Write a protein that binds this ligand. Sequence first.
Ligand code: HEM
Ligand code: HEM
Ligand SMILES: CCCCCCCCCCCCCCCC(=O)NCC(=O)O
Lengths: 445, 453
Amino acid sequence: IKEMPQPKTFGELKNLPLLNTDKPVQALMKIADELGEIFKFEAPGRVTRYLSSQRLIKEACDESRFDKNLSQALKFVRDFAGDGLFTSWTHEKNWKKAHNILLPSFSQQAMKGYHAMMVDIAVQLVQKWERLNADEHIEVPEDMTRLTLDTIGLCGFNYRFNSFYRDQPHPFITSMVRALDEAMNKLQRENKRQFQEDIKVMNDLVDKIIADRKASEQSDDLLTHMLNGKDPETGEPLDGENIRYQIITFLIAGHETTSGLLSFALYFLVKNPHVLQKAAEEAARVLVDPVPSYKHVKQLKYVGMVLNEALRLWPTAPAFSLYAKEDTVLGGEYPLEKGDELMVLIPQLHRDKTIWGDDVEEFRPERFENPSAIPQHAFKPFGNGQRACIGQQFALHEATLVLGMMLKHFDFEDHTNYELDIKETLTLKPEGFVVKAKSKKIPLG
Amino acid sequence: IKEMPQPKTFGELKNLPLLNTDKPVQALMKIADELGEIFKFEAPGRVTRYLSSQRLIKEACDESRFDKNLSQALKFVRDFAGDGLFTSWTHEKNWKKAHNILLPSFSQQAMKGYHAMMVDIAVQLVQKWERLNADEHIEVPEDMTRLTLDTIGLCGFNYRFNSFYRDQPHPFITSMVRALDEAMNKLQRANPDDPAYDENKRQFQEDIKVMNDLVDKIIADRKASGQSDDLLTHMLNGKDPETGEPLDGENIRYQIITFLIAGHETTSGLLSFALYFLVKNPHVLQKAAEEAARVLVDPVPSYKHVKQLKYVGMVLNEALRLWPTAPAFSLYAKEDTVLGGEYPLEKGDELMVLIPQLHRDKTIWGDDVEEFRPERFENPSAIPQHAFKPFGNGQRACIGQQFALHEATLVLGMMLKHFDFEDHTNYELDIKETLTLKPEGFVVKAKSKKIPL
Ligand code: HEM
Ligand code: HEM
Ligand SMILES: CCCCCCCCCCCCCCCC(=O)NCC(=O)O
């Protein structure tokens, strides 16, 4: 049995003044660097324990002992995402209900169904970059957000945000980003009703999506299942309020982290030109049709390894929370009472040298040549167990398709020798990452 | 010999107070409705004579007697367009020089070469409209400007403005519109050096600077590349067969500005008006769409097929009849002479062809000149000479007329092939003037016919 580490507290404020940054996850990583595999963190009214080692997170991922918790961050996100799948408790009726109803929308059958629409948006990205003049450059996370938002809008809701027809972010994005940034800042605390205004912009958009569906054509997408699908357990469909919450939930969770992933993957590729070369070689060899087929995207194995290694270094959803189901001893050293909260600090987990070796900071896609020769619970960018990411296959198929087309159609240049600056909005993304792309002059479909 | 009519004068201000409007051409049309085929118009320091009848304009277009004049409007535009082709005198060395050097860019060879690029931009317009959601609409002159600006940028300079990637107007457009507007408004200032107005002129200089920054970008993108054969290639490399000389750098910059403006603004206006008249005349719309569907049989239009869109072309010509988007041009008298056997003119005297009013000459077109009927152009060689002048006259006529008409026929054809249109607001025609003419606030909804590209 051991006493759990905790950084300095300042009376009433507890550990809160130790963040005081626009980069709380990276700050918590520094704290983990100093204090080790586990430390307690208190804020006024709340307490949690940050885990950073595979040996402990392995235990935390045991669902007989720990269940998904709503961290304070997620409690703030619940103000607009409600009891949608991301921000609901496992024991809430609508969690299992919505999970059962929406899981078929992520069957491989459904993926094959989404592919043509993903290609629609991907082609828009490629054409945008084909049409740049020589003195121009690419704003990478901005365009990746254009792509991923449009993709979830079309595939999921037959709604076109038309982000590439705008040189500024879509209104939905501006409000979403401000709302997420506000939840994040609020963790460290007029902002108030600016928040309500951003929520209202997002909900107005949901209104537009529902109205566009009802005013139409036979459909079979995510929204079709939200509106009509029945839970096999209870026989019930989702009610209107939960449907609205699921739409918000999927529009946000369904694009933000994928944008981050494509941005980090391109970053690491232009910073490791031999790895870039291997990936481009694969894209050119596999993607032989004028636009990619589903079956060919499944063959992009090195590109998929590149994406996994980007997720290892900077998991764009960088933490998840658990609570203790019953009194127990964690790791045989740390006693926990029922209700006690844990935070998995994923980037730090992914730098556990006892698992990955001493060169954890290098970008080596080949770490994933044999993806489950990797020890249990060493790699958790998509969370855990029955509460793991429902959209993982969607995300990786989209990102593999898109990164594949990018590598097929252009040579990329890190023309500014960009210094990595990671912006935090609960999620992570490179900020200010820009490149130049030289077309290989290969025609589309 | 007859005394020439002139509307009311106001003490030193002369006829100026009869305008005082952001719609001066429409006002001159009302004045012409009152005074007839010709009237003198004086402002402080200047005088011109507005012509509205074919019988007089036929004489004005005789180049043995009259040559192109730089009107005050064009002298104001010359502040940023310099001695480019549009704003130079016929007998300026750089006019003939630039004419000889640049005319080859409008040969049929060259047009056939531009077709794929025009299709590139047209396809972008069609895709934008295909991708609108059910609750949305189209801002017509805005999207026509996106299309026409991009088309001259690409065909002329291998430069992509990427206007369809922006939800507001391109910066170049905002500055161009403000500069043209300033040129227009300045014509009606009694005392232009009044403090409120030189406070005003700062913006003019700023807008000229934006347009020139864009020129800098076009030149640098061309210089940074290693093979072309467009308008810019001829600007940079062509030599005048007469003098042996190339254009100098300064004149090249003026030409780039000139073609970026003249090469898109009036074509945007034309497509906008044409669509307006089509939705206001659904029978004509139906006929034109039938022609488009029958003719444009390939997944994207061929050069040869656009030429077969004869009714579409008639539609465009009738739009130009009712609202010629370059609505006037100016002439001077080469020597003392008599106009129409009634009106004496001295060397130097100016004439202005008031083109929309000419285009409403009932002795030429019949009594229903206000109605939209494309069939007016079925046999154009029965139309009297100089009855129809949307592209100016003689050796100073529009160098881009075929370019413009091919572009607009292609684009309007694809629009009619791919969508049914709805005048969902029952739009009330509002014509904005910036020297040139264009509908303002014109919006429609388009329902896709779901035909692939
Ligand atoms: C690279 C992209 C993505 C990453 C890194 C990611 C990460 C995660 C993580 C860590 C969780 C668990 C959160 C927790 O335990 O509190 C989660 C859950 C979830 N994600 Fe993803 N996600 C990604 C893409 C997507 C996409 C594209 C969608 C939708 C199409 C999506 C929808 C969801 C939903 C609905 C949940 C809640 C699942 C449930 O509890 O039933 N995600 N994601
Ligand atoms: C509907 C479209 C257009 C209309 C109605 C139009 C109208 C005119 C008119 C009326 C003139 C004579 C002006 C005067 O006498 O003062 C002119 C000249 C000119 N136009 Fe067009 N224009 C159009 C399209 C274009 C295009 C697409 C281009 C370039 C690609 C172009 C380039 C020019 C140039 C350079 C001149 C000056 C010619 C010279 O004097 O050498 N125009 N235009
Ligand atoms: C570089 C080309 C710029 C395009 C400008 C095209 C101008 C369109 C025709 C000019 C219209 C002039 C008529 C406006 C009112 C008027 O009274 N003008 C007389 C005058 O300015 O002297």
